[PDB]
Amino acid sequence: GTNVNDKVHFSNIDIAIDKGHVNQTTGKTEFWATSSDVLKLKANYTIDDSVKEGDTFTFKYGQYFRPGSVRLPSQTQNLYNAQGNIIAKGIYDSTTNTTTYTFTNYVDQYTNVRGSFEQVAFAKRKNATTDKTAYKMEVTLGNDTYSEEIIVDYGNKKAQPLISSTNYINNEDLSRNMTAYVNQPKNTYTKQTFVTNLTGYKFNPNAKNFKIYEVTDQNQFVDSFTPDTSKLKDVTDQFDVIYSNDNKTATVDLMKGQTSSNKQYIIQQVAYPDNSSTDNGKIDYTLDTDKTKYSWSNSYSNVNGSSTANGDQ
Numbered sequence: 001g002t003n004v005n006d007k008v009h010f011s012n013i014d015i016a017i018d019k020g021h022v023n024q025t026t027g028k029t030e031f032w033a034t035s036s037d038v039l040k041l042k043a044n045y046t047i048d049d050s051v052k053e054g055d056t057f058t059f060k061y062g063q064y065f066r067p068g069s070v071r072l073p074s075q076t077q078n079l080y081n082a083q084g085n086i087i088a089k090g091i092y093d094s095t096t097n098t099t100t101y102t103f104t105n106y107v108d109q110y111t112n113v114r115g116s117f118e119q120v121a122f123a124k125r126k127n128a129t130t131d132k133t134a135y136k137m138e139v140t141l142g143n144d145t146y147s148e149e150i151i152v153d154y155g156n157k158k159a160q161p162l163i164s165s166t167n168y169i170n171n172e173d174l175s176r177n178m179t180a181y182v183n184q185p186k187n188t189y190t191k192q193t194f195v196t197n198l199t200g201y202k203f204n205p206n207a208k209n210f211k212i213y214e215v216t217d218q219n220q221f222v223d224s225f226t227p228d229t230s231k232l233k234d235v236t237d238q239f240d241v242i243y244s245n246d247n248k249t250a251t252v253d254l255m256k257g258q259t260s261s262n263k264q265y266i267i268q269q270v271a272y273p274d275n276s277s278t279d280n281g282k283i284d285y286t287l288d289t290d291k292t293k294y295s296w297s298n299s300y301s302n303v304n305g306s307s308t309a310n311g312d313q
């Protein structure tokens with residue numbers, strides 16, 4: 001095959017926020033990634049007649065934008081013609097944030113071939129880290145580049161002693177990969193009982209993927225809830241995580257034997273759906289402290305095959 005990025009022409013390119021939340025102060029539409037929104041990429045295209053089966057073309061996504069929803073994008077990506085046949089089979093590489101498509105025999109079925117597509121998309125959370133910030137969302141389809149500014153707000157309320165979000169949903173097993181932030185305000189406690197209770201999911205203790213990281217720098221609390229754990233101090237083995245209710249409940253005393261603590265923590269967990277008929281469910285967190293019990297909750301909805309997530313106190 002040949003690279004035919006110069007022979008596949010995209011037009012009417014747009015990035016939508018679905019549904020989008022209007023900021024009642026500025027009047028602008030925002031992307032509230034932890035209040036059920038996703039992005040959508042849409043375009044029409046034409047294909048020169050010299051293109052043949054096996055020729056390739058790319059969608060290159062920019063540093064703040066990726067395909068997928070709360071659920072990470074599939075490695076395999078089909079593009080369908082208006083008749084419902086697969087015109088191109090794609091391979092998405094997360095390291096290069098690029099899908100390479102290979103045309104099928106269907107590109108040779110007709111002359112003057114024309115198609116369109118709508119693809120769910122999202123912020124690249126490890127890069128678009130910060131709330132209430134406009135990010136250039138960019139894509140190059142073939143050789144056609146498009147971008148628009150999208151204000152992202154993940155709702156990381158820094159004054160809250162307990163807040164949690166879905167980091168991502170795994171595309172292969174539909175597991176919820178969670179991030180909870182404990183003590184962003186850096187208060188001092190003598191009691192700190194951290195409880196997670198799952199509805200529709202279970203933990204797997206033997207997988208050793210309930211992780212506790214001690215924060216040493218306030219910037220580690222990225223608003224996107226996708227922190228770079230490779231840079232953090234992994235203190236998990238210092239704590240006793242107690243499972244109950246057939247692995248639906250996890251309890252940990254974050255004081256770990258100390259009389260007083262103003263330590264701050266990032267906690268990551270993996271919650272597996274009970275079965276393959278649905279991945280809906282709910283995750284409830286509580287932090288019981290000296291004089292206050294804090295609560296945060298996470299819920300999900302599937303919309304036309306994209307995963308959406310909502311967190312709330």
Ligand SMILES: [Ca+2]
Pocket residue numbers: 014015016017148
């Ligand atoms: Ca738009």
